[PDB]
Structure formats: C-alpha cells, structure tokens
Structure 1
Amino acid sequence: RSTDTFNYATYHTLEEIYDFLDLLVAENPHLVSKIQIGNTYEGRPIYVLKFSTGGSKRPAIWIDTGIHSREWVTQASGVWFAKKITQDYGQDAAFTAILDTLDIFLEIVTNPDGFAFTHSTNRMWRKTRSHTAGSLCIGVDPNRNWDAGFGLSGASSNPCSETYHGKFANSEVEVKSIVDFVKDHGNIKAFISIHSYSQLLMYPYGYKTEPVPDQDELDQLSKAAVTALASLYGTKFNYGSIIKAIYQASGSTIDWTYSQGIKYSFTFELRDTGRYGFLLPASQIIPTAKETWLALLTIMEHTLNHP
C-alpha cells in the first residue's frame, strides 16, 4: 500500500499499526526512524518513531498514546499524528521550525499486549497482561506503576483492580522500557501522555495536592492549548493539575517525568465526555486528531521558544 491510501478514519489492529510504522519509515527514511525500546511481557516488540532533522540527541518532545489499551481513539490519533508530521515538515513553516531544533518521539502503541487483547478478547481491557504471583488476576495498571508516589493513596494493592499498582515501581516492562529510554536520552524537554476520555488537559501532580513550582507557567500554557484545540470545532476541554481536574492518582506517568526535570509534562484526555466513552465512533477519529494536533503544536511551540 502506501500511507497515502491508509484509512485514518477507521480503527486498526496491532498488526495493521505495526505495518503502518514500517511503511511510514520506508517512505520517509531521512526523517523518520523506528526504534525498539523493549519487548512486552508477552514478547512483542515495543516501537517508538523518531522524527528528526539531524544532530545527536537534540532536545526532544515525547508523545505517547495507548498506554491504557481500550482507549482506542488515542492509538488512532497517534497514527494520524505520525502521518501529519511527515506531511507538514518542509511545508508548514511553524512546524518545520519545531523539527529543525527539536526531535519528536512518538510511541503509538505503548501497551501492545493490552491492545492485542482488546481486539481478540475484551474490548475494555485497560492494564498490561503480566501475571502476578499469588494471584489469578492478570495485569498491572501501567499508569500506577511509575516511581512517583508509588503505592500511595490513589492506586490499589488488589491485583484484580483496574488500578493495581504492581509489586514494585517499574515492575511492568512497558513502563521500565520508557523509563530507561528517557533516562538514557537525558534531553527530553516535553513529555505528553495521551489518554481518553473526558476532554481534559492536565499537568502534575496527581499523587498530591501541593502544586508544582511551575504551576503558573503550565496553567497559562494549558489555557493557550485548549484555546487552540477549541478553535477548530468548539470542543471544550477543562484543565488543571491531575488531582484537581480529575482525581488523585499515584505512580502516574507525568508525576514521574516532571520529577526527572521534564518541565512540560502534560496529559490529554481526549473526546468525548461519556456518551460513547472509550467506544468513540470511527467517524470522530480524524476530528479528534486534528483538534488535538493544534494543542500539541501549542505545547511544542512553547517548548521550542523556552530552551
């Protein structure tokens, strides 16, 4: 095929997304590369796309989708983002300026075992697919497994729970693989984790009520990003710290990344507000991706202009 004839307005399987990664790289090999950062619990490769115009470990933007496997609009938007980057580089001046200074890393399927499971067995699967000693229940919540307030209020110690934090921080290879990549890279400037649903744009912390020292800057940037997002279809997002805007969550992704010095640590909750919830119709994939892209541009532009 080609990525020009790929159907961005439908949901795809893991194999189809993985094939898309290869085709995108084959079509754009001086712009895009595919990095394997690990293997999942069940042995599947974990892939990140690196978009770059040169240099050695340039300051970088990290974007990940699908860490909760049932949130299908996120992986679908990720595929759309990947194609959009290759379309706009060298054509759109604003985005070209971003990529001329920063690299972008995009992990489209952050939880491949869960994603496979949502296609084969249980559409509403959330967690990883690891076995837990002393339990028959399967999986750890990858968004409770990070080393930031790990195991504190805002997660469950029950292995059968949707928010089970796991036996120890980074027990899940899908999480440890990202941690290892981020620490080895050492020059990640923004980290954006994309989830659905609720229509929120949030910054740290989720595990405690104390505001981050950078709250004023992150709140202003949030306001700018949701303004940009709403400009296209009028989609209304709220924003704030995780703990204020949704609820307390311990061991979650951007609390950790912020603790590593990544100032521009954000998470999106995409469409909708519950009518379809995780079952967002395919006809809403592209509108969701388009409006989200405007918000992403806002954050990346801010990152570019504040070295």
Structure 2
Amino acid sequence: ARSTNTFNYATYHTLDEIYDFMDLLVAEHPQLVSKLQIGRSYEGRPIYVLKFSTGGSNRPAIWIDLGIHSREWITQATGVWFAKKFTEDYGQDPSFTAILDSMDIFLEIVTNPDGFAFTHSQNRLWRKTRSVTSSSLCVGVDANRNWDAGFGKAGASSSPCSETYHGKYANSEVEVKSIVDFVKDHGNFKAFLSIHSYSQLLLYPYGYTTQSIPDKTELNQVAKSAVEALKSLYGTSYKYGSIITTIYQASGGSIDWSYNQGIKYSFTFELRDTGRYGFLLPASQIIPTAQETWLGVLTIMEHTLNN
C-alpha cells in the first residue's frame, strides 16, 4: 500500500504492514495524527500508540487498545479500520467532529506485538506475550490477567504453562506496564476501552470481585445504548453486563484496573462471532465487524463528551 487509500482493509495483515500503515497515516494527516512510542516489547519491538487530536494541552482523552490477546486477529484489523475512519469522519460526521474538537483519542492497534508476530510465524492460536519464565520451559503471560486489579485472585492461573497465566507480579509484562505508566502520567483519561474477540459481549467492571461498582446504573444504560447502536447495521446481537455476572470471575483485567484509577467509562468488547469461526473469522467479516463496532464505540464516546 502506497497510500492509506490503497491499503486493503478487507484482509489480515502482518506486523510490518501495520507498522507501515501507521507511518502512511501520519504522513497524510500530520495535523490530526501523531505516532508515539510508549515502550518496547519483551523481544524489543516498538510499542506504538496513535494520538488523534485537534490541539489543546492535555485534553480529556479516550484510550482504545486492541490485540492484547494476539490470536484475536479481528481486533488488530478493526484497529486499522478505526484509525482510517477517524481521519475520514473528522469534519464530515457532526458527532465525531464534536468529539475530536474537545477530546483526544489514543489508539493502540497492536498491544502485544511479540505474540502477534508469533501467530504469523509459528502458531496462529498463540494468545500470550513471549516473555521467558525463570523456572519454566513455558513462555508468556496472559497480558489481560497481569494488571493490578485483584491480581493473583481466582480467575487466573499461577502456572506458567497455563493459557491464563497471570505472570510473576502485577505489571511484570512490559506491554502492560508501558500502558500503565503512560495513562498514569497523562492523568486526564475519561474512557478506557479494550477490544477482544470472540463472543459478542460488551462488559463493564468488575471481573475480580462480586462487588457492584458505584456507577452500575449509568454504565449499564450506556452499554444498552451501545449494543442497540451496534445491532442497527447488521443485526449482530450482543449481551452486556459486568464481567463476573456475564462470564465468570477473572482477575487482573485491564478495565478493572482503569476503573479503579477513576476512569469511569471502562468497557471491554468481545467481537464477532459466537463460535462458528471463533478466532479464525473470515476476512470477509472484517469490514462489517469494524463498521458495526464503530457505532457502539461512538455511542460511548458521545456519552463521555457529555458526562
């Protein structure tokens, strides 16, 4: 792709193609987008965040991360589509324009670059990082069980070979600490969205405790509105609720952490499908998935700008 306009959004890409895409986008919209390097992965790959902004100084912001579980390919694909969409819609869509005129958006397309490279090179179903454990032959940590939110509690595994291993200590994974430091240093995030696949769920905190969050009525109503919006395009049906009541107890998750940091609008999306294809969703479903997910995300951003 020589332009973001010639990039093929209807196919799955490699890490290099995605990183090149970032530079194309910055080159084409220098006034709206910038590429920030917030760290380096365990295997030394740069960890990039795209910042979308119309100006100001430390405007209230929205965090969006995709690909923390490497095999959920639909999420990185949706992330590239979102990046392009932001640049297309600014000045076109009255609602989205209103959002960018007052808030900044930080997008992390490939949150776990080492696992992603591995899914292309050796094992398509790899979901963890690629950090090497001391007293183990097993590699990697489930980065969505490594956050300081009920870390090590039930709903995570203490065995290194487990697909749900939580890691040695909270924030042991550089991929997670890089986000933690950035968000804490910024201090003006209002929303935190983490995108995964699959199951068609929109969840709010918590997963590590049965305790109800103080903002449950509001987040529940936002979730209902977001799922109604998403369903509107293709009729895709999502369920919504707190993590623990919807799925099961799960500790060390990112939205439990972000909520505990005071970022009220903390939600996780589990994208298509419900099991027919699971992690190997056909390339043909990339654009429709991205399109409907954008409506759900925009709904949350609108509430955020207003509240």
The TM-score bracket by the shorter chain reads over 0.9
Mapping of residues 1-307 of structure 1, within 5 Å:
1-306=2-307
Which segments of 5 or more consecutive residues in structure 2 lack a partner in the other structure? none
- Partner Cα separation in structure 2 for residue 145 and residue 215 of structure 1: 24
Q: CA deviation at 1:246?
A: 1.2
- Partner Cα separation in structure 2 for residue 57 and residue 281 of structure 1: 39
Partner SS, residue 47 of structure 2: strand
Q: CA deviation at 1:82?
A: 0.3
TM-score (normalizing by structure 2): 0.99
- Partner Cα separation in structure 2 for residue 158 and residue 215 of structure 1: 33
- Partner Cα separation in structure 1 for residue 286 and residue 295 of structure 2: 15
Q: CA deviation at 1:156?
A: 0.2
- Partner Cα separation in structure 1 for residue 286 and residue 190 of structure 2: 28
Q: CA deviation at 1:162?
A: 0.6
Partner SS, residue 119 of structure 1: helix
Q: Amino acid of the residue matched to residue 249 of structure 1?
A: A
Q: Amino acid of the residue matched to residue 30 of structure 2?
A: P
- Partner Cα separation in structure 2 for residue 244 and residue 287 of structure 1: 29
TM-score (normalizing by structure 1): 0.99
- Partner Cα separation in structure 1 for residue 31 and residue 103 of structure 2: 15
- Partner Cα separation in structure 1 for residue 144 and residue 123 of structure 2: 19
- Partner Cα separation in structure 2 for residue 15 and residue 247 of structure 1: 36
Q: CA deviation at 1:109?
A: 0.1
Q: CA deviation at 1:245?
A: 1.0
- Partner Cα separation in structure 2 for residue 56 and residue 107 of structure 1: 21
Q: CA deviation at 1:16?
A: 0.3
- Partner Cα separation in structure 2 for residue 14 and residue 57 of structure 1: 30
- Partner Cα separation in structure 2 for residue 104 and residue 252 of structure 1: 21
CA RMSD of aligned residues (A): 0.4
Q: Amino acid of the residue matched to residue 209 of structure 1?
A: T
How many residues get paired? 306
- Partner Cα separation in structure 2 for residue 280 and residue 92 of structure 1: 29
- Partner Cα separation in structure 1 for residue 259 and residue 93 of structure 2: 30
- Partner Cα separation in structure 2 for residue 15 and residue 248 of structure 1: 36
Q: CA deviation at 1:57?
A: 1.0
- Partner Cα separation in structure 1 for residue 58 and residue 8 of structure 2: 33
Q: Amino acid of the residue matched to residue 294 of structure 1?
A: L
Q: CA deviation at 1:295?
A: 0.3
Q: Amino acid of the residue matched to residue 224 of structure 1?
A: S
Q: CA deviation at 1:119?
A: 0.1
- Partner Cα separation in structure 2 for residue 34 and residue 279 of structure 1: 29
CA shift digits 1:17-40 (9 cap, x unpaired): 000000001000000000000000
Moved over 6 A (4+): none
CA shift digits 1:173-229 (9 cap, x unpaired): 000000000000000000000000000000000001111110100000000000000
Sequence identity percentage: 81
Q: CA deviation at 1:289?
A: 0.3
Q: CA deviation at 1:2?
A: 0.2
- Partner Cα separation in structure 1 for residue 22 and residue 246 of structure 2: 34
- Partner Cα separation in structure 2 for residue 66 and residue 31 of structure 1: 23
Q: CA deviation at 1:86?
A: 0.1
Q: CA deviation at 1:247?
A: 1.3
- Partner Cα separation in structure 2 for residue 211 and residue 11 of structure 1: 38
Which segments of 5 or more consecutive residues in structure 1 lack a partner in the other structure? none
